[PDB]
Amino acid sequence: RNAFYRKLQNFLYNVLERPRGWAFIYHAYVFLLVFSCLVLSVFSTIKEYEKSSEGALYILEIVTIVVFGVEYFVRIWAAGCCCRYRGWRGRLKFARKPFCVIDIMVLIASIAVLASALRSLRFLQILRMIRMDRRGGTWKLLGSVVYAHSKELVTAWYIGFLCLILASFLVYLAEKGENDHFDTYADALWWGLITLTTIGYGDKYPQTWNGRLLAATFTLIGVSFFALPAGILGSGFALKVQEQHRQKHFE
Amino acid sequence: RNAFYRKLQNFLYNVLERPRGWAFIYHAYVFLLVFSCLVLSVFSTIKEYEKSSEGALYILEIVTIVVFGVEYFVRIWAAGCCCRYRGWRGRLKFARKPFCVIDIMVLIASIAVLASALRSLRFLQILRMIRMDRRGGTWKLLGSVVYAHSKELVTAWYIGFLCLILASFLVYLAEKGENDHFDTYADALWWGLITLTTIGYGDKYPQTWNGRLLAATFTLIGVSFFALPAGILGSGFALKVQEQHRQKHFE
Amino acid sequence: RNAFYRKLQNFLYNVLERPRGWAFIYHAYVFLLVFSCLVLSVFSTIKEYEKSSEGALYILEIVTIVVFGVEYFVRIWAAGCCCRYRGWRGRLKFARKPFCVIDIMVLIASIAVLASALRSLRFLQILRMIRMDRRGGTWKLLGSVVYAHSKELVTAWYIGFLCLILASFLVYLAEKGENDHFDTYADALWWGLITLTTIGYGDKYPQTWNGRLLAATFTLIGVSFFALPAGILGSGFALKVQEQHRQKHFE
Amino acid sequence: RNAFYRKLQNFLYNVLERPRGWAFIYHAYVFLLVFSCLVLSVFSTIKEYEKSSEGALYILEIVTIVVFGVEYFVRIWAAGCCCRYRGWRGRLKFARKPFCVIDIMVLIASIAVLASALRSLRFLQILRMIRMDRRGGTWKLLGSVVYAHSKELVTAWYIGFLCLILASFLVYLAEKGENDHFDTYADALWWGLITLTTIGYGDKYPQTWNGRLLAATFTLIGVSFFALPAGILGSGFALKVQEQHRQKHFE
Ligand SMILES: C#CCN(Cc1ccc(F)cc1)c1cc(C)c(NC(=O)OC)c(C)c1
Ligand SMILES: C#CCN(Cc1ccc(F)cc1)c1cc(C)c(NC(=O)OC)c(C)c1
Ligand SMILES: C#CCN(Cc1ccc(F)cc1)c1cc(C)c(NC(=O)OC)c(C)c1
Ligand SMILES: C#CCN(Cc1ccc(F)cc1)c1cc(C)c(NC(=O)OC)c(C)c1
Ligand SMILES: C#CCN(Cc1ccc(F)cc1)c1cc(C)c(NC(=O)OC)c(C)c1
Ligand SMILES: C#CCN(Cc1ccc(F)cc1)c1cc(C)c(NC(=O)OC)c(C)c1
Ligand SMILES: C#CCN(Cc1ccc(F)cc1)c1cc(C)c(NC(=O)OC)c(C)c1
Ligand SMILES: C#CCN(Cc1ccc(F)cc1)c1cc(C)c(NC(=O)OC)c(C)c1
């Protein structure tokens, strides 16, 4: 009874460790559970709906603690699949990795919390969401694509900042006394930031003909130069996928 | 008198079934008719304009029922073009497909409705709009492009969610008591969602210097990381078109 | 004295007709003049600043009429450069083209107007702006790129429309009586259109927990599926430039 | 003691002049210092927080003056690294370049200012931010990419302007008397500009059924044709990076 043993250990370590396919289904389900916990906590932040929120949240938190403990133990057991971590010493030295210790300390802290502390619960929940990666692949990919396109990101940032400063100063000059919205340069800078991002709250906006005339040009330039970085990064990601796919199809 | 018979049957089945060219003109016209029906229903949802809207909608609904019935019958007849569905048995077994039964049940239901029920009319109208595809090609193309770029979509979603949570929490801390807009963490989360998408209703916005200072950075990051997915998918679609066009030109 | 004659005629026809380089400077200057005329008319639409607006606009309109007449006559004269239009008969038959007759009728109409009619001035000014192309190249390029990417434009439009309808209906159901903003389905549709485009006026927005909860998902999907078409078309234009540049460098 | 001399001079000139790698760390730190100075000035523009703002700003301005003077002198000394600028005459003729004279005059002016003048401080601070490039590389790259994609930028601008004019005029006609927001054509143009950019202040918006019906189409077209330029430029930048990277990898 060792062929089935090794088969199961291999498959379980592969699914729980770096997955590639349908193994993501389990990760999606556990993510959905933790997300439901987070949403219930957010609902518990209110007074009207506090009752039902805590009623569900208590049992859901117990369930997620049970699930996380079981997952951690099965991961520790299946760690013997890799040729490096073998035996008692191998599994003992496996735990020294940052993420395993993070997991064990996290479940210890949350079990202590559950057994005015909701702030700690929020912190631990967002930290668990941070833990979802477990390998920093997202950060590495983002850093690679950002470094590849550093020159254009820098030029876009430079020109956008210059346009923001110029537009804010000109509008502040043109509407110093005729509009109470722009009473200090800080207010004009806030207006420029909120308009060149196209958020447009509406709390501030030019009213004199000078301000509207100057905006009709400077906002037209600034909106594009503020949307540029997202387009650059999206095209970078798409081109990287294209090149990777063609290269992998070659070999 | 069978060469013309087969010619007409072939051409009509090709036009009514998968079209490639000017056949889309008829589809566009029928879509325009159903869209006019939908708009008239929306106008009939109001009390001031109920009279004229209903007066037009009755006859337009009758016309569209007639058109859909004629189209269904001619499609059933022309189904004999394909080598698979032939004869009485072939045409009888043709109707078992999901979309043909959907069409027949749909026109039956709408004719029954026309012969406080406007909710059913709305449901059936949006269902007809769903039926416009008839092959799920849109869904398949979207799924293919999404699967191809899954890694970058995931990284963008992860970083955007983290930025949203961090910004909302920091602003909520900075404006707990000095601004009545942010009285619960749910309100801060709503503000963050509405600002990082650049919708910017204006119902909530920071007013203290802390909130504005923290936004000036976190919204700058979050707006880009929330615009990223659309750019990624658009570039994916464009690159897919380029590769498909070059490949088809090769052969 | 015929080498200089032909040299000047060739150069002037090339600059005035399809330009390629610094010839665009003259076009830019004339565009700036007509744009100034338009802006002065817009200022004349107001009562406070009517005086100075008309004072400048009268002389500017006279100047632009003079310039347009001179340009039309010199174009007619230089039309003899092309091997097709030659001599009296050639130049007479040249005028039959749609744009030349448009220009002559336009300057006739504007000279008649200048010699409560400001509406006609606005119409003729926007028409002159339309005339700026003179070849429909913009429309042809747009049509080509749109036709190339028709399938993805259609899928994006389909999914975006479905998302808009679903989100609007769900929010209307969730906020029929608890929010006076959503009192008819037309209002909910207007809100959905204004939110999925990220315009976000703020005149309408959900207030109940149901509406906010449903928006937190449906707007996240819809904003991306509404931004998709612009990204698709921009990537199409960029890829077309890349391919054209490489092809021209090949030959 | 001349091998170390030349080694240090070479390394310092390379780091202070065109950098390529970790040399950017020093530039980032000096940028952070000047940015802190700017933010403190902006805070000093207010009356409530003037005290602490000026208290920090005085010493920070002294520190930045010291740093800039030291940097200028060390740059002048290290200029001897280049084979062109050598000796007393070489270093003397080095200063004639626009940026060196700009820097020396700038530090002279700021030292004079520090030894109701805050407007001059703002001007000199934004000018120092302008000086951050020192080579105009950002402007050259932007100009190159803009020139490469000139045709599509022009077509997008043309169609977007036409759509803006048409939509504004139609909405103004449809809401001349029933909505006080649109009382002059200038107001309608302002509304169109603020809506087609998706800024959406909310100060103006259609209320009659005509205006909403016409917007539901014209804004849908205009939003895409106004977002087009940023997407075009972003894709251009990404494709330029791809081609440059492949070409450099070739050689
Ligand atoms: C102003 C501006 C942009 N920034 C700074 C910046 C970057 C990203 C941000 F998110 C915020 C601020 C910037 C601009 C330039 C030209 C350079 N180049 C340089 O100094 O080399 C001599 C550098 C090193 C930084
Ligand atoms: C254009 C413009 C403004 N800037 C530059 C800037 C910022 C702060 C300064 F103090 C000075 C210059 C800018 C713009 C965006 C969209 C982002 N976010 C982003 O790129 O996400 C990927 C950032 C990080 C900076
Ligand atoms: C937080 C976040 C994003 N999401 C979830 C998500 C995705 C799309 C949505 F639209 C909404 C939520 C996410 C993030 C990561 C790193 C992973 N990777 C992983 O767990 O493998 C170990 C997965 C499987 C999902
Ligand atoms: C960035 C960001 C936020 N997220 C990720 C997210 C969402 C919910 C969570 F609970 C957790 C993480 C996000 C953003 C967009 C634009 C979309 N829509 C889309 O991509 O359409 C193609 C989706 C589906 C998710
Ligand atoms: C709903 C939706 C989109 N539209 C219509 C549309 C297009 C552009 C607009 F700007 C507005 C409306 C649409 C959708 C599909 C699936 C098809 N395909 C089809 O019928 O072939 C069988 C067609 C022909 C049109
Ligand atoms: C997604 C979405 C909505 N739709 C589709 C749609 C429109 C009307 C219907 F009645 C039905 C379906 C849509 C979206 C945009 C941005 C545009 N404009 C554009 O693409 O400019 C290039 C158009 C022309 C249609
Ligand atoms: C209207 C419009 C766009 N513009 C002007 C413009 C450009 C950029 C701006 F930011 C602002 C205004 C424009 C349009 C066309 C067709 C041409 N072509 C031409 O005249 O050749 C005969 C030119 C030379 C300029
Ligand atoms: C589409 C549209 C409007 N236009 C064209 C236009 C402008 C003024 C006119 F008077 C006439 C035509 C437009 C749009 C944008 C985003 C920008 N900014 C930009 O591209 O940054 C890179 C500019 C410079 C012009």
Q: Are B188 and B169 in contact (CB under 8 A)?
A: yes
Alpha carbons within 13 angstroms on the beta-carbon side of residue A194 total 26
Ligand 8 atom nearest residue C35's Cα:
10
Resolution in Å, one decimal, please. 2.5
Cα→Cα distances B96→B72, B99, D124, Å: 14, 8, 78
Report helix, strand or coil for A158: helix
- Which residue, among B103, B21, B97, has the nearest Cα to B64 in the 3D structure? B103
Report the domain count for chain C: 2
CATH number where D152 lies: 1.10.287.70
Alpha carbons within 13 angstroms on the beta-carbon side of residue B32 total 6
Q: Are residues C100 and C154 in the same domain?
A: no
List the binding residues of B. Answer: 135, 151, 248
Amino acid at D45: T
Distance CA D152, CA C141 (A): 8
Nearest-10 Cα torsion for D145, D147, D149, D153: 110
Q: Could you write out the three-class secondary structure of D214-237?
A: HHHHHHHHHHHHHHHHHHHHHHHH
Closest residue by Cα to atom 1, ligand 1, is A158
List the binding residues of D. Answer: 135, 151, 248
Nearest beta carbon to residue C184 from set B45, B199, B227: B45
Do the annotations mark residue A140 as ligand-binding? no
The minimum CA-CA distance between C5 and chain A, rounded to whole Å, is 43
Q: Which residues line ligand 5 (CB under 6 A)?
A: B 24, 27-28, 31, 129, 132-134, 138; C 154, 157-158, 161
Q: Are residues C18 and C119 in the same domain?
A: yes
What residues of chain B lie within 8 A of the CB of A229, using their CB?
Answer: 224
The minimum CA-CA distance between D177 and chain C, rounded to whole Å, is 16
Q: D93: domain range?
A: 3-134
Report helix, strand or coil for B49: coil
Distance CA D40, CA B213 (A): 12
CB contact (8 A) between residue C202 and residue A198: no
Q: Are C114 and C61 in contact (CB under 8 A)?
A: yes
Check the CA dihedral A172-A177-A181-A183 and report its sign. Answer: positive
Interface residues of chain C, partner chain B, Cβ below 8 Å: 148-149, 151-152, 154-156, 158-159, 161-162, 165, 169, 184-186, 189, 195, 198-202, 205, 212, 216, 219-220, 223-225, 227-232, 234-236, 238-239, 243
- Which residue, among B82, B79, B123, has the nearest Cα to B99 in the 3D structure? B79
Q: Are residues B100 and B37 in the same domain?
A: yes
Residue where one domain finishes, among candidates D106, D134, D162: D134
Q: Annotate A93-102 with b (16+ C-beta within 10 A) or e (fewer).
A: ebeeeeebee
Distance CA A143, CA B56 (A): 59
Residue where one domain finishes, among candidates A120, A135, A150: A135
Distance CA A118, CA A41 (A): 8
Do the annotations mark residue A240 as ligand-binding? no
Interface test with D, best of C25, C237, C239 (most D CBs within 10 A): C237
Q: Are residues C110 and C47 in the same domain?
A: yes
CB-based contacts of D204, cutoff 8 Å, min separation 6: D181, D182, D187, D190, D191, D194
Q: Which residues line ligand 7 (CB under 6 A)?
A: C 24, 27-28, 31, 129, 132-134, 138; D 154, 157-158, 161
Q: Are residues B29 and B118 in the same domain?
A: yes
Distance CA B30, CA B64 (A): 8
* Vertex D75: Cα angle to D70 and D79 (nearest 5): 155
Distance CA B174, CA B207 (A): 10
Q: Are C192 and C219 in contact (CB under 8 A)?
A: no
The minimum CA-CA distance between C44 and chain A, rounded to whole Å, is 13
Distance CA A7, CA A2 (A): 8
DSSP conformational letter for A79: G
Closest residue on chain C to B242 (Cα) = C239
Ligand 6 atom nearest residue D216's Cα:
8
CB contact (8 A) between residue B199 and residue C224: no
CB contact (8 A) between residue B241 and residue C158: no
Closest residue on chain A to B223 (Cα) = A197
Q: Are residues C95 and C211 in the same domain?
A: no
Closest residue on chain C to D197 (Cα) = C199
Experimental method: cryo-EM
> Nearest ligand, CA of residue B224?
2
Q: Are residues C26 and C83 in the same domain?
A: yes
Distance CA C123, CA D14 (A): 61
Distance CA D218, CA D221 (A): 5
Q: Are residues D214 and D167 in the same domain?
A: yes
Q: Is C192 in the pocket of ligand 6 (CB under 6 A)?
A: no
What residues of chain C lie within 8 A of the CB of D148, using their CB?
Answer: 241, 245
Nearest beta carbon to residue C200 from set A49, A200, A209: A200
CA B207 to chain centre: 39
Distance CA B139, CA A52 (A): 38
Q: Is C199 in the pocket of ligand 4 (CB under 6 A)?
A: no
> Please, what's the largest Cα pairwise distance for chain D?
87
Residue where one domain finishes, among candidates A88, A105, A135: A135
Closest residue on chain B to A132 (Cα) = B158
The H or E element spanning position A114 is helix A98-114
Q: Are residues B146 and B120 in the same domain?
A: no
Ligand 2 atom nearest residue B224's Cα:
21
Quick one: angle between helices C150-174 and B209-250, nearest 10?
140
Q: Are D231 and A238 in contact (CB under 8 A)?
A: no
List the binding residues of C. Answer: 135, 151, 248
Chains that touch B (3 or more CB pairs under 8 A): A, C, D
Quick one: angle between helices D150-174 and D137-148, nearest 10?
80
CB-based contacts of A94, cutoff 8 Å, min separation 6: A76, A79, A85, A100
Q: Are A62 and A107 in contact (CB under 8 A)?
A: no
Distance CA D216, CA D196 (A): 12
What residues of chain B lie within 8 A of the CB of D231, using their CB?
Answer: 231, 234
Distance CA D67, CA D30 (A): 8
Nearest-10 Cα torsion for A190, D190, D165, D160: 10
Structure tokens given for A145: 């694509």
Q: Are residues C11 and C30 in the same domain?
A: yes
CATH number where A62 lies: 1.20.120
Q: Are residues C125 and C174 in the same domain?
A: no
The minimum CA-CA distance between D81 and chain A, rounded to whole Å, is 26
Q: Could you write out the three-class secondary structure of chain C?
A: CCHHHHHHHHHHHHHHCCCCCCCHHHHHHHHHHHHHHHHHHHHHCCCCCHHHHHHHHHHHHHHHHHHHHHHHHHHHHHHHHCCCCCHHHHHHHHCCCHHHHHHHHHHHHHHHHHCCCHHHHHHHHHHHHHHCCCCCHHHHHHHHHHHHCHHHHHHHHHHHHHHHHHHHHHHHHHCCCCCCCCCCHHHHHHHHHHHHCCCCCCCCCCCCHHHHHHHHHHHHHHHHHHHHHHHHHHHHHHHHHHHHHHHHHHC
Q: Are residues B32 and B156 in the same domain?
A: no
How many residues appear in chain A?
Answer: 251
Question: How crowded is residue D180: how many other Cβ atoms within 10 Å of its Cβ?
Answer: 10
Interface residues of chain D, partner chain B, Cβ below 8 Å: 49, 198, 200, 202, 209, 231, 234-235, 238
- Which residue, among D159, B203, A5, B85, has the nearest Cα to C202 in the 3D structure? B203
Interface test with B, best of C144, C223, C241 (most B CBs within 10 A): C223
Residue D161 Cα to ligand 7 midpoint, Å, equals 10
What residues of chain A lie within 8 A of the CB of D190, using their CB?
Answer: 212, 216
> Nearest ligand, CA of residue B27?
5
Q: Are A85 and A79 in contact (CB under 8 A)?
A: yes
